[PDB]
Design a protein around this nucleic acid. Structure first.
Ligand code: MG
Ligand code: MG
Ligand code: MG
Ligand code: MG
Ligand code: MG
Ligand code: MG
Ligand code: MG
Ligand code: MG
Ligand code: MG
Ligand code: MG
Ligand code: MG
Ligand code: MG
Ligand code: MG
Ligand code: MG
Ligand code: ZN
Lengths: 125, 37, 135, 137, 178, 133, 11
RNA sequence: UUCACAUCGACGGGAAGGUUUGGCACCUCGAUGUCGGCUCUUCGCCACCUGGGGCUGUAGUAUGUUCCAAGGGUUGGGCUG
RNA sequence: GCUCAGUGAUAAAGGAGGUAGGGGUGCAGAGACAGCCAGGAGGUUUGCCUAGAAGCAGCCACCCUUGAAAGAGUGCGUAA
């Protein structure tokens, strides 16, 4: 639910000036990427696969193995899915800056907080 | 352990439980042990 | 194994099975009965096995009527036989049953022994069935 | 279980066995054999009536016939003695000696009732000492 | 709401100090300190009469199961720090023996090597050289656990009953060789 | 404590009795002649007998019912009972023989009356296929 | 297997 | 031996697979061609061995059957298109 | 309103204290389910069979009595 928001802003779909062929979007900085939450059994079920290109070359991680090993890749991999594919897609993907700690070294760029209009996006335990 | 599609109590002391989604039969005697599958 | 003693033509139309049997519906001979829930074709072999099973499990219980019978012929062409040059050889015989049809009737046991017996009988049938009691 | 009709007839039968009797004897039993139950029932039905009953079953049957002062004897398991024919001491005496044999056999005497008066576990000693009709008359 | 377990209140005896912060319960008794967290739905009430009555925030089937569980859990940590828990296992066989020395429990069960077992702080293990082992601890779960780890090394076999068994056990004894 | 079955006025054969209860430390001749003396006091019949023993090897025994099957076999004048009771009837006895067998068996029963014992004997004869009136 | 699949327009 | 369900499981039923023998004729006809070996892989698991288990009509050794498991292994000859 | 299976992409007989509902029928306030305490008897070791069969290898019968209740016995067990 967060990754959709992120995709919208990175793409520029929330500006009156939006154009499909151009980058009007923002930069988005994701912090605390190891505290991201997922519903139900996904922590142990969801499966990140990647394939060498040799036969028998398939590799699989559960979401949790991944999140202990290199947790940024989880959110990068979830947002890249929702960005356009192709030249503009990739060039867009560089605008997503992800950090595992609660601190980002971007203070100079004066980040605003992200607006979230979704109801269900905030989980409570 | 027997494994089969149809698990029923095979006597009075038998008990059908549900473990991690699969239906099991635990009993006093070992032979009556079954798992669904 | 049940079967007709004579017919003129050997070979016969597959037919089509639609609707409900209204006539074989009632239970008019015994007390407890096994009723067909679904539209199917019963070979004489299956009826044999069902009757046998119910009879052996009832044993000390008395009576079993078989309310059906395999009077419609069925034909088959052999293996490695190219299509054409005539309809094949009648191999076996089926009874056509439609939902609601009574198959087995039974009398001379307590309701429990009857339930168990009829269950074991239903196990050898191609179809879903039901346990019913006399009115 | 037991239907309400059978229980009203049971309480009525206990009440009719109560109107004729001049004395009550309360006794509780837990964990004892049926053989000595049947020896005690070789001795008892000759001279006396023995009826084991529930707490409420005794409650509603006793309040009306004015034995009510005996209500505290109904706490715990309840077996009762009513004397229809023979005297009180002939019925009371065998029970205490049977309890002295029942020391390891788990018997206790809760109390007895006579003269419309309640007598505790010890005070029934007098009720044991009373003589037969031949000596009284 | 209608679990016959959650209705029964827990009695905190004197000697038992109960500290409650929000959903986190820390109890300090004669034998030590035990800490637990409650989940969202379970609300445990510490009375004025000195009792613990378990209530629940909502009733989902979830919370029902929860509250039965936690009333018994915290009864076990209360009674656990008060008196404690004793699990006793005896060993059956020729040459089967155990020796507690310092921080180890040494088992000679008929393996090649002596088996060593590091005893956790919370537990106090007493050995009868008469082939009996009693383990005492404030936490039900940890004592049970360790006891099972003992029993694991050589589970009682069917024929002669040999191996480590709990003090009260039905062991199927088949007649071997007839 | 052991249960044995012995004949009325005969005791101490080697195979049936002596070794069996004698391996429990029971005195053979005392039990034998006391059992034969108590059988001589009552009407002589085959006696199933429960003998109770103690740690000091002293023993006390209770003589049970001489079998109602055997007593009703001699009451009907027959030998072998019916192979199929209530189907084939092998004999008939009077109610006086009922009260007689129930009288000899009265100290060995739990019955509080003579009618209960008589109905018990009638039930045993109806069980072995012997008719009663 | 005694059941077929859905090819082309059927599908 | 007792005991349906250790192991077999008759009379019948419900399936999966797509490796056998087939049916079809959608496919290519111009030079889109079948079975064995050599060399060289690779993958599946319905597991022959090797790792861990449950049940046994498992005393032990060795089995039997079944569960998870496809990482590795799976010889050399006489004989055949 | 429902689902907790990532079901939500496909297949059956069969299995099931999954779960949310609906409908009959049992009991109970002289206390129903579960637990716990006790009792579970007499004929009799039923007859037959068998070296033995005593509730409990097998066959037939399966009544009666004392009773709050207790089957000629549901399973284990003994050569019995
Ligand atoms: Mg229509
Ligand atoms: Mg079927
Ligand atoms: Mg196919
Ligand atoms: Mg089966
Ligand atoms: Mg063509
Ligand atoms: Mg070419
Ligand atoms: Mg496999
Ligand atoms: Mg292996
Ligand atoms: Mg194995
Ligand atoms: Mg062997
Ligand atoms: Mg492998
Ligand atoms: Mg491989
Ligand atoms: Mg391989
Ligand atoms: Mg899916
Ligand atoms: Zn079982």
């Amino acid at each position: 639910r967060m990754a959709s928001t992120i995709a919208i802003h990175i793409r520029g779909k929330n500006l009156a000036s939006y154009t499909p062929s151009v980058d009007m979007g923002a930069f988005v900085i994701v912090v605390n990427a190891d505290k991201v939450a997922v519903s139900g059994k996904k922590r142990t079920q969801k499966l990140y696969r990647r394939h060498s290109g040799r036969p028998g070359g398939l590799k699989e991680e559960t979401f949790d193995q991944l999140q202990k090993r290199i947790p940024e890749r989880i959110i990068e991999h979830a947002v890249r899915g929702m960005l356009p594919k192709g030249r503009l897609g990739r060039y867009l993907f560089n605008h997503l800056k992800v950090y595992k700690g609660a601190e980002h070294p971007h203070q100079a760029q004066q980040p605003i907080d992200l607006p979230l209009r979704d109801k269900r996006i905030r989980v409570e335990k | 352990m027997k494994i089969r599609a149809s698990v029923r109590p095979i006597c009075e002391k038998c008990r059908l439980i549900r473990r991690r989604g699969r239906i099991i039969v635990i009993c006093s005697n070992p032979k009556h042990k079954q798992r669904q599958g | 194994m049940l079967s007709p003693k004579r017919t003129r033509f050997r070979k016969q139309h597959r037919g089509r099975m639609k609707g409900i049997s209204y006539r074989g519906n009632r239970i008019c001979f015994g007390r407890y009965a096994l009723q067909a829930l679904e539209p199917a074709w019963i070979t004489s072999r299956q009826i044999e096995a069902g009757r046998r099973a119910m009879t052996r499990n009832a044993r000390r219980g008395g009576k079993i009527w078989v309310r059906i019978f395999p009077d419609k012929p069925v034909t088959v062409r052999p293996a490695e036989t190219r299509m054409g040059s005539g309809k094949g050889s009648p191999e076996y015989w089926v009874a056509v049953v439609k939902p609601g049809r009574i198959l087995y009737e039974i009398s001379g046991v307590a309701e429990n022994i009857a339930r168990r017996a009829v269950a074991i009988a239903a196990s050898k049938m191609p179809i879903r069935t039901q346990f019913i009691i006399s009115g | 279980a037991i239907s309400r009709t059978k229980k009203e007839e049971t309480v009525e039968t206990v009440q009719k066995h109560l109107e004729n009797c001049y004395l009550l004897a309360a006794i509780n039993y837990k964990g004892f054999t049926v053989k000595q139950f049947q020896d005690l029932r070789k001795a008892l039905p000759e001279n006396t009536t023995l009826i084991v009953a529930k707490n409420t079953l005794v409650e509603k049957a006793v309040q009306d016939t004015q034995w009510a002062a005996i209500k505290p004897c109904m706490k715990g398991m309840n077996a009762w003695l009513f004397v229809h024919s023979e005297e009180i001491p002939i019925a009371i005496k065998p029970y205490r000696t049977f309890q002295k044999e029942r020391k390891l056999e788990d018997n206790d005497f809760t109390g007895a009732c006579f003269e419309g008066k309640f007598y505790g576990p010890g005070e029934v000693k007098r009720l044991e000492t009373m003589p037969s009709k031949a000596e009284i008359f | 709401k209608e679990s016959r377990i959650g209705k029964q209140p827990i009695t905190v005896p004197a000697n038992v100090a109960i500290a409650m912060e929000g959903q986190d319960l820390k109890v300090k008794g004669p034998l030590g300190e035990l800490s637990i967290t409650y989940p969202r739905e379970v609300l445990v009430e510490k009375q004025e009469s000195g009792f613990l009555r378990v209530r629940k925030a909502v009733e989902t089937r979830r919370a029902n199961q929860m509250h039965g569980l936690f009333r018994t859990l915290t009864d076990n940590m209360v009674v656990g720090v008060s008196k404690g828990f004793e699990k006793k296992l005896q060993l059956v066989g020729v040459g089967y023996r155990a020796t507690v020395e310092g921080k180890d429990l040494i088992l000679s069960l008929g393996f090649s090597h002596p088996v060593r077992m590091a005893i956790p702080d919370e537990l106090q293990v007493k050995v009868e050289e008469n082939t009996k082992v009693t383990v005492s601890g404030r936490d039900k779960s940890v004592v049970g656990q360790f006891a099972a780890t003992i029993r694991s090394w050589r589970p009682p076999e069917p024929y002669k009953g040999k191996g480590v068994r709990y003090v009260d056990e039905v062991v199927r004894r088949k007649e071997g060789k007839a | 404590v052991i249960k044995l079955a012995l004949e009325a006025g005969k005791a101490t054969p080697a195979p049936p009795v002596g070794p069996a209860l004698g391996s429990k430390g029971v005195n053979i001749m005392a039990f034998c002649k006391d059992y034969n003396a108590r059988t001589a006091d009552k009407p002589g019949f085959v006696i199933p007998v429960e003998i109770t023993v103690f740690d000091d090897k002293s023993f006390t025994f209770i003589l049970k019912t001489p079998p109602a099957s055997v007593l009703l076999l001699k009451a009907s004048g027959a030998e072998k009972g019916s192979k199929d009771p209530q189907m084939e009837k092998v004999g008939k006895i009077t109610i006086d023989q009922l009260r007689g067998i129930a009288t000899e068996k009265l100290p060995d029963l739990n019955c509080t009356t003579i009618e209960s014992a008589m109905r018990i004997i009638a039930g045993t004869a109806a069980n072995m296929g012997i008719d009663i009136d | 297997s005694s059941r077929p699949q859905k090819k082309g327009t059927a599908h």
